[PDB]
Motif scaffolding. Structure first.
Motif, PDB file in Angstrom:
ATOM      1  N   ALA A 190       0.875  -1.474   0.263  1.00 20.68           N
ATOM      2  CA  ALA A 190       0.343  -0.040   0.005  1.00 20.68           C
ATOM      3  C   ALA A 190       0.999   1.281  -0.433  1.00 20.68           C
ATOM      4  CB  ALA A 190      -0.826  -0.086   1.113  1.00 20.68           C
ATOM      5  N   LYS A 191       2.273   1.466   0.646  1.00 19.62           N
ATOM      6  CA  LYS A 191       2.701   2.366   0.577  1.00 19.62           C
ATOM      7  C   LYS A 191       3.741   2.874  -0.577  1.00 19.62           C
ATOM      8  CE  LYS A 191       7.181   4.049   2.573  1.00 19.62           C
ATOM      9  NZ  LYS A 191       8.657   4.158   2.139  1.00 19.62           N
ATOM     10  N   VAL A 192       3.953   1.433  -0.855  1.00 21.31           N
ATOM     11  CA  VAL A 192       4.504   1.894  -2.791  1.00 21.31           C
ATOM     12  C   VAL A 192       3.598   2.421  -3.444  1.00 21.31           C
ATOM     13  CG1 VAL A 192       6.483   0.618  -1.402  1.00 21.31           C
ATOM     14  CG2 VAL A 192       4.576  -0.747  -3.098  1.00 21.31           C
ATOM     15  N   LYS A 193       2.559   1.755  -3.585  1.00 23.69           N
ATOM     16  CA  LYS A 193       1.667   2.058  -4.103  1.00 23.69           C
ATOM     17  C   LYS A 193       0.954   3.411  -3.868  1.00 23.69           C
ATOM     18  N   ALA A 194       0.327   4.276  -2.894  1.00 25.26           N
ATOM     19  CA  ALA A 194       0.491   5.127  -3.253  1.00 25.26           C
ATOM     20  C   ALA A 194       1.963   6.433  -3.570  1.00 25.26           C
ATOM     21  CB  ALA A 194       0.243   5.682  -0.988  1.00 25.26           C
ATOM     22  N   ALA A 195       2.250   6.080  -3.183  1.00 25.27           N
ATOM     23  CA  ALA A 195       3.790   7.057  -4.523  1.00 25.27           C
ATOM     24  C   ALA A 195       3.802   6.870  -5.493  1.00 25.27           C
ATOM     25  CB  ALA A 195       5.169   6.615  -3.801  1.00 25.27           C
ATOM     26  N   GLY A 196       3.359   6.019  -6.301  1.00 23.69           N
ATOM     27  CA  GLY A 196       3.313   5.862  -7.682  1.00 23.69           C
ATOM     28  C   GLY A 196       2.900   4.660  -7.873  1.00 23.69           C
ATOM     29  N   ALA A 197       4.161   3.960  -7.218  1.00 19.87           N
ATOM     30  CA  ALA A 197       4.466   3.081  -7.749  1.00 19.87           C
ATOM     31  C   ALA A 197       2.969   1.496  -8.345  1.00 19.87           C
ATOM     32  CB  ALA A 197       5.155   1.582  -7.200  1.00 19.87           C
ATOM     33  N   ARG A 198       3.487   0.910  -9.362  1.00 20.77           N
ATOM     34  CA  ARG A 198       2.446   0.866 -10.343  1.00 20.77           C
ATOM     35  C   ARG A 198       2.423  -1.488 -10.366  1.00 20.77           C
ATOM     36  NH1 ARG A 198      -1.188   2.831 -14.042  1.00 20.77           N
ATOM     37  NH2 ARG A 198       0.145   1.411 -16.033  1.00 20.77           N
ATOM     38  N   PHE A 199       1.332  -2.252 -10.170  1.00 21.28           N
ATOM     39  CA  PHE A 199       1.676  -3.645 -10.476  1.00 21.28           C
ATOM     40  C   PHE A 199       1.460  -4.185 -11.081  1.00 21.28           C
ATOM     41  CE2 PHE A 199       3.420  -4.183  -5.852  1.00 21.28           C
ATOM     42  CZ  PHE A 199       3.557  -3.257  -4.910  1.00 21.28           C
ATOM     43  N   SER A 200       2.084  -5.239 -11.564  1.00 25.18           N
ATOM     44  CA  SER A 200       1.350  -6.164 -12.466  1.00 25.18           C
ATOM     45  C   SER A 200       1.160  -7.615 -11.838  1.00 25.18           C
ATOM     46  CB  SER A 200       2.283  -5.501 -13.701  1.00 25.18           C
ATOM     47  OG  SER A 200       2.496  -4.906 -14.645  1.00 25.18           O
ATOM     48  N   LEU A 201       0.361  -7.948 -11.227  1.00 23.78           N
ATOM     49  CA  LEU A 201       0.651  -9.603 -11.175  1.00 23.78           C
ATOM     50  C   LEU A 201       0.349 -10.732 -11.898  1.00 23.78           C
ATOM     51  CD1 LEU A 201      -0.190  -8.815  -7.472  1.00 23.78           C
ATOM     52  CD2 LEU A 201       2.116  -8.334  -8.330  1.00 23.78           C
ATOM     53  N   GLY A 202       0.845 -11.812 -11.743  1.00 20.36           N
ATOM     54  CA  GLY A 202       0.108 -13.132 -13.009  1.00 20.36           C
ATOM     55  C   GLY A 202       1.314 -13.203 -14.061  1.00 20.36           C
ATOM     56  N   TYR A 203       2.508 -12.136 -13.630  1.00 22.08           N
ATOM     57  CA  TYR A 203       2.920 -11.814 -15.061  1.00 22.08           C
ATOM     58  C   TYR A 203       4.521 -12.489 -14.089  1.00 22.08           C
ATOM     59  CZ  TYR A 203      -0.409  -9.250 -17.378  1.00 22.08           C
ATOM     60  OH  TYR A 203      -1.925  -8.951 -17.919  1.00 22.08           O
ATOM     61  N   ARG A 204       5.399 -13.657 -15.572  1.00 23.97           N
ATOM     62  CA  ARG A 204       6.123 -14.425 -14.731  1.00 23.97           C
ATOM     63  C   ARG A 204       7.474 -13.941 -16.564  1.00 23.97           C
ATOM     64  NH1 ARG A 204       7.242 -18.953 -17.406  1.00 23.97           N
ATOM     65  NH2 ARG A 204       8.654 -20.122 -16.889  1.00 23.97           N
ATOM     66  N   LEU A 205       8.545 -13.280 -15.350  1.00 21.76           N
ATOM     67  CA  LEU A 205       9.189 -13.134 -16.766  1.00 21.76           C
ATOM     68  C   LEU A 205      10.208 -13.970 -17.087  1.00 21.76           C
ATOM     69  CD1 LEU A 205      11.824 -10.379 -17.682  1.00 21.76           C
ATOM     70  CD2 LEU A 205      13.062 -11.207 -15.547  1.00 21.76           C
ATOM     71  N   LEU A 206      10.429 -14.280 -18.628  1.00 21.94           N
ATOM     72  CA  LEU A 206      10.659 -15.457 -19.588  1.00 21.94           C
ATOM     73  C   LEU A 206      12.246 -14.835 -19.595  1.00 21.94           C
ATOM     74  CD1 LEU A 206       7.628 -16.570 -21.262  1.00 21.94           C
ATOM     75  CD2 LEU A 206       8.123 -16.828 -19.182  1.00 21.94           C
ATOM     76  N   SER A 207      12.539 -14.170 -20.436  1.00 19.14           N
ATOM     77  CA  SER A 207      13.615 -13.214 -20.644  1.00 19.14           C
ATOM     78  C   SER A 207      14.176 -12.393 -20.343  1.00 19.14           C
ATOM     79  CB  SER A 207      14.202 -13.762 -21.717  1.00 19.14           C
ATOM     80  OG  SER A 207      12.926 -13.228 -23.017  1.00 19.14           O
ATOM     81  N   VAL A 208      14.809 -11.283 -20.401  1.00 19.86           N
ATOM     82  CA  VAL A 208      15.747  -9.447 -20.482  1.00 19.86           C
ATOM     83  C   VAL A 208      17.241 -10.213 -21.685  1.00 19.86           C
ATOM     84  CG1 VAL A 208      16.941 -10.402 -18.352  1.00 19.86           C
ATOM     85  CG2 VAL A 208      16.544  -8.489 -19.099  1.00 19.86           C
ATOM     86  N   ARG A 209      17.361  -8.764 -22.391  1.00 24.36           N
ATOM     87  CA  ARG A 209      18.342  -8.294 -22.695  1.00 24.36           C
ATOM     88  C   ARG A 209      18.560  -6.756 -22.553  1.00 24.36           C
ATOM     89  NH1 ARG A 209      13.809  -8.483 -27.605  1.00 24.36           N
ATOM     90  NH2 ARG A 209      15.115  -7.119 -28.396  1.00 24.36           N
ATOM     91  N   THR A 210      19.781  -7.044 -23.246  1.00 30.88           N
ATOM     92  CA  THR A 210      20.377  -5.216 -22.708  1.00 30.88           C
ATOM     93  C   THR A 210      19.054  -4.554 -24.425  1.00 30.88           C
ATOM     94  OG1 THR A 210      22.119  -6.317 -24.084  1.00 30.88           O
ATOM     95  CG2 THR A 210      22.565  -6.049 -21.779  1.00 30.88           C
ATOM     96  N   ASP A 211      18.801  -3.288 -24.499  1.00 27.13           N
ATOM     97  CA  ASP A 211      18.417  -2.746 -25.268  1.00 27.13           C
ATOM     98  C   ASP A 211      19.230  -0.916 -24.844  1.00 27.13           C
ATOM     99  OD1 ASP A 211      16.633  -1.672 -27.154  1.00 27.13           O
ATOM    100  OD2 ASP A 211      15.565  -1.381 -25.950  1.00 27.13           O
ATOM    101  N   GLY A 212      20.412  -0.881 -25.418  1.00 28.93           N
ATOM    102  CA  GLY A 212      20.917   0.464 -25.427  1.00 28.93           C
ATOM    103  C   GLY A 212      20.564   0.815 -24.007  1.00 28.93           C
ATOM    104  N   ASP A 213      20.025   1.729 -23.168  1.00 29.68           N
ATOM    105  CA  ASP A 213      20.796   2.100 -21.888  1.00 29.68           C
ATOM    106  C   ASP A 213      19.438   1.190 -21.675  1.00 29.68           C
ATOM    107  OD1 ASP A 213      18.021   3.320 -22.423  1.00 29.68           O
ATOM    108  OD2 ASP A 213      19.232   5.432 -22.756  1.00 29.68           O
TER     109      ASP A 213
END
Ligand code: FDA
Ligand code: FDA
Ligand code: ITW
Ligand code: ITW
Lengths: 412, 412
Positions: free
Chosen positions: B191-214
C-alpha cells in the motif's frame, strides 16, 4: 503410482470419457487415473458468482437442443436445470446486416466451387471488398475476417451462433443456459466417475510421454513443481490440439492428415448498483456494434457483459495488462459511443470480472470424432475432431468415439 | 509499456526495494513497475485462515528481535502487532539431545580447521557415526544430515531456530509471531509503495531479458498465456537464486564466484472439533521425534501443525500426491506413534491445509548483500546473498544494498 487406464484432461471431454469407460463391463477391476494441470475440473467451462450475486459463465454459456442433443441429454442425465437464453433476436437489422443475409443466400450456390476460400474473399464476390467488410463486421465475430476461416466454415459459424442465426434462417433453434452454471454438470460427471472408482490428481501438467513396453510412461509436474512419473496401460489425451502440439508427440502429423487452428476469446462481466440500462429497454437484448465491445449483452436486470474474439479479444487483454483503471474507463467510453449517450451518464461498475482464453476456440481446417496415434496407440479426444468444432457437443461426440476406441484396444 | 525502474519479484525483498527507492529524492518523477508471477504479493510469506477461525503461516511464521532487528523495525514502522511465539521450550532434553549439546560445545574449537566438512562428519568425531546420527536426528531438521550443509552452517542453523536454540546456549533470544499474519506487513509495504505511484502487474512471469541500448527489454507471460514485452532503464531482480537460473542472465557465473543450494520445506495444519491434545498437556509445546512428522506443534487449544524439510518435506509432498485420504491417515498413524497412544484415540481432522515449497530455503555454499551483472548492470536482490540466508532479515538487508546499487546507477 500407476493405473490400467489414464485420462489427461478433466474438461467435459475427459470426464465424459471416464464416464463411458466406467459404464462398460470391460473395465471392471481396472484402475482409472485422471490428470489435469488445473486445480479444478471443467476446462473451458468456468462458472463464477459475480460479486456473489448472480451466476455467470466465463467459458461456455449457452447451448441448443436442436444442435446439441447429446449435451441436452447430459443435462437431463445429471438433473441440471436449464433456463431460456434470451440473446437470439436480431429484429433491428441494419442495412449491412440485411445485405449480408441476402448476399449469403444469393452466393450459397457458389459454395461448391469457392467454398474453400476465405469468407472475406467469398463475400467480396457480391459487391466488392469494401461492401464485404461492412457486411461481415455487423455479425460481431471478428473470426469471420480471418483468411483461415473459409466460406463453408463461416456459414457454419453464422448459422450456429444464437445472435446471428437468423442470417441463415435458423431462427427455429432454441437456446438455453444452465440455471446454476455448467459447472454443475462438470461436478455431476466428476462425482459420477469418482463414485465408480476413478481417482483424480488435479494440479498436474503432463510434460512428456513415451512408450514403455505394452503401456506408457508419463512425466508430470505439479503446479508447485513436484515432479511425478506415472505408468499406465491405456492413455487418452482429452486435451485440445493447442496442448497436443506441446507434448512432442508429432501432433498433428502422426495423428491425422488435417490441420488445426485456434482463436482467442474474451468475456467481461460488469454489475452495477442499479440496472441503469432499463432506461433504454435494453434488458435481455444484445447489441452488435462496429466498436471494440462488438457484442454487448444486458442480462435482464442483473448485469451486462461483452464477448469478443480474435483481434478484439487480444485488444481487451492487452488493455487489461495496462491496468484495471484504464480497462474500466475504456469500457465506459465504448459503452457511450455504442449506445449514443453522454459518457458521464454511464455509471461506474459495482464489481466486474473478465477472462481471456488464448485458445478459446480450436477448429479443424477441413474427420474422425477421435484420433489414434499412428506410432503408439494413444487416443486423442477433443471437440476439434468432430463436426461441432468449438462446441461442447463436439466434446461429447469425441468422448464417445475415444472410449469406443479404447474398449476396442482393451478387447484386442 | 515502459518504465524508468522495474522490479521483478513482489516478496518482502522486492517490495522493500521499491520502498527504499521511492524514499529517495533521486527517484522523484520516475515511474516504477513491479512484476510478479503470482496473483498476490508476498512470495514465501503466505498467511491463510484455517477453517476461518485462526490465522496460520504457510510460509515464514516467526522472528526474533535479537537476530532480526531490521524486521522488528519494519513491523513497528507499519504498525503490525506482534505476539509471543511459544515454541522455544526445550526444558527436558533427551539423552541424545543433551549429548549433542555437549558435543557441539567440545568440538567447537575444531571449527576453524574443519568447519567446512559436513555437519554429520564433524559430529562423528565425538563418538562415531552411529552416535552422531542419533544426536543430529533429535534436532528435527533433516538439513543437518546433508553433505552440502557444513558444520559452520549447522551451528548457525541450530543456534538460530527457536525449538533448538538452547543447544548452543542461545536461550536468551525471544521469538514473536504476527497477530494477524505476516501478510499484514506485505500489504503495508505494498500500500505504501502504491500510494507513492508504483504500479503493480501481478500474474506475469519474466521469461527472458536482454540489453536494449541504455535499458532492458523484458519478455513476460501472463498466467493465462498473454505475452507481454516491457522496457525499462533500471532493473532489479528481487527473486531467489533458483529463479535466477531459469533466466538467460548467465547466473551465477556472471554475478558472483559463489554457488547456491536449496532445500524443500513442507507445512501441514490441522484443526479438530476438540483440543484433544490438552489431555496430554501439550498446548504450546513442540515435539521433536524420530518420526516422519519430525516437529509437531500444538498451538494452545486452536490447532496443531508439523514442519519438515529436505527428504521429509518431499516425503509428505509425495504422500499428498498419492491422495488426501492416505495423506490424512498417515498423519494420524504418525501422531499416534509420536505420542505413544493408539491410532484410534486420535480423531479425524475437521479441516486442514498444507504447503510444499520446492525451494523453501536457498543458501550460499560459503559475500555482498546484493549482486550485479558484470556486463548488463542488472541488480539481484535475495536473502541468500546475506549472512541471514533463509530468513526475512536477509531480504531486508539485500533490499537495502540493492536499492543502494540502483541509486548509484541512476546518479552515474
Ligand atoms: C469464452 C468461451 C465461450 C464458449 C466456449 C469456450 C470459451 C473459451 N465454448 C467451447 C467449449 O468451452 C469447448 O468446446 C469445450 O469445453 C471443450 O471441452 P474439452 O474437455 O474437449 O476441452 P477443454 O479445453 O474444456 O478441457 C481440456 C482440459 O485439459 C487440461 N490440459 C490441457 N493440457 C494439459 C496438460 N499438458 N497436462 C494436463 N492437463 C492438461 C486443461 O486444463 C483442460 O481442463 C462453447 N461451447 C458450447 O457448446 N457453447 C458455448 O456457448 C461455448 N462458448
Ligand atoms: C515454510 C517456510 C518457512 C519459513 C521461511 C520460508 C518458508 C518457505 N522463511 C524464509 C522467508 O520466507 C524468506 O527468507 C523470505 O520471505 C524471502 O523473501 P524474498 O522476497 O527475498 O523472496 P521470495 O521467494 O519471498 O519472493 C520472490 C518473489 O519473486 C517471484 N518470482 C520469482 N521468479 C519470478 C519470475 N521469473 N517472474 C516473475 N516473478 C518471479 C516469486 O513469485 C516471489 O513472489 C522464514 N524467514 C524468517 O525470517 N522466519 C521464519 O520463520 C521463516 N520460515
Ligand atoms: C460456442 C462458441 C465458440 C465458437 C465456436 N466457433 C467460433 C468461431 C468464432 C468465435 C467463437 C466461436 C460461442 O458460443 O461463441
Ligand atoms: C527461517 C526458517 C528457514 C530455514 C533457514 N535455514 C534452514 C535450514 C533447514 C530448514 C529450514 C531452514 C525456519 O524458521 O525454519
Amino acid at each position: 503410482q500407476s493405473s490400467d487406464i489414464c485420462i489427461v484432461g478433466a474438461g467435459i471431454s475427459g470426464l465424459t470419457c471416464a464416464s463411458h469407460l466406467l459404464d462398460s463391463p470391460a473395465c471392471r477391476g481396472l484402475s482409472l487415473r485422471i490428470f489435469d494441470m488445473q486445480q479444478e475440473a471443467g476446462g473451458r467451462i468456468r462458472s463464477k458468482m459475480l460479486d456473489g450475486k448472480a451466476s455467470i459463465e466465463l467459458g461456455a454459456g449457452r447451448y441448443s437442443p436442436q444442435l446439441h442433443p447429446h449435451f441436452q441429454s447430459a443435462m437431463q442425465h445429471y438433473s441440471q436445470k436449464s433456463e431460456v437464453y434470451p440473446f437470439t433476436q436480431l429484429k433491428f437489422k441494419s442495412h449491412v446486416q440485411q445485405k449480408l443475409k441476402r448476399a449469403m443466400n444469393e452466393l450459397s450456390p457458389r459454395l461448391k466451387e469457392h467454398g474453400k476460400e476465405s469468407f472475406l474473399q467469398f463475400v467480396s464476390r457480391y459487391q466488392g471488398h469494401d461492401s464485404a467488410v461492412g457486411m461481415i463486421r455487423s455479425m460481431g465475430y471478428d473470426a469471420l475476417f480471418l483468411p483461415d476461416i473459409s466460406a463453408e466454415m463461416a456459414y457454419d459459424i453464422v448459422g450456429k451462433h444464437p445472435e446471428i442465426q437468423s442470417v441463415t434462417d435458423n431462427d427455429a433453434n432454441q437456446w438455453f443456459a444452465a440455471e446454476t452454471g455448467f459447472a454443475g454438470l462438470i461436478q455431476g460427471i466428476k462425482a459420477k466417475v469418482k463414485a465408480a472408482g476413478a481417482r483424480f490428481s488435479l494440479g498436474y501438467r503432463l510434460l512428456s510421454v513415451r512408450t514403455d513396453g505394452d503401456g506408457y510412461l508419463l512425466q508430470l509436474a505439479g503446479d508447485d513443481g513436484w515432479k511425478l512419473e506415472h505408468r499406465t496401460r491405456h492413455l487418452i489425451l482429452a486435451i485440445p490440439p493447442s496442448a497436443m502440439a506441446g507434448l512432442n508427440v508429432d501432433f498433428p502429423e502422426a495423428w491425422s492428415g488435417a490441420r488445426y487452428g485456434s482463436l482467442p476469446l474474451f468475456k467481461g462481466f460488469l454489475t452495477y448498483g442499479e440496472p441503469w440500462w432499463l432506461d433504454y429497454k435494453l434488458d435481455d437484448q444484445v447489441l452488435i456494434v462496429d466498436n471494440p465491445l462488438r457484442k454487448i449483452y444486458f442480462k435482464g436486470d442483473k448485469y451486462l457483459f461483452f464477448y469478443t474474439d480474435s483481434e478484439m479479444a487480444n485488444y481487451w487483454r492487452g488493455c487489461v495488462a495496462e491496468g484495471e483503471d484504464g480497462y474500466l474507463e475504456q469500457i465506459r467510453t465504448h459503452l457511450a459511443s455504442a449506445l449514443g449517450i453522454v459518457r458521464e451518464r454511464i455509471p461506474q461498475p459495482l464489481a466486474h470480472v473478465h477472462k481471456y482464453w488464448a485458445h478459446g476456440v480450436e477448429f479443424c481446417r477441413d474427420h474422425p470424432s477421435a484420433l489414434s496415434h499412428r506410432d503408439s496407440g494413444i487416443i486423442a479426444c477433443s471437440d476439434a475432431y468432430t463436426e461441432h468444432c468449438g462446441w461442447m457437443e463436439g466434446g461429447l461426440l469425441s468422448a464417445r468415439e475415444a472410449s469406443r476406441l479404447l474398449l476396442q484396444r482393451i478387447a484386442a
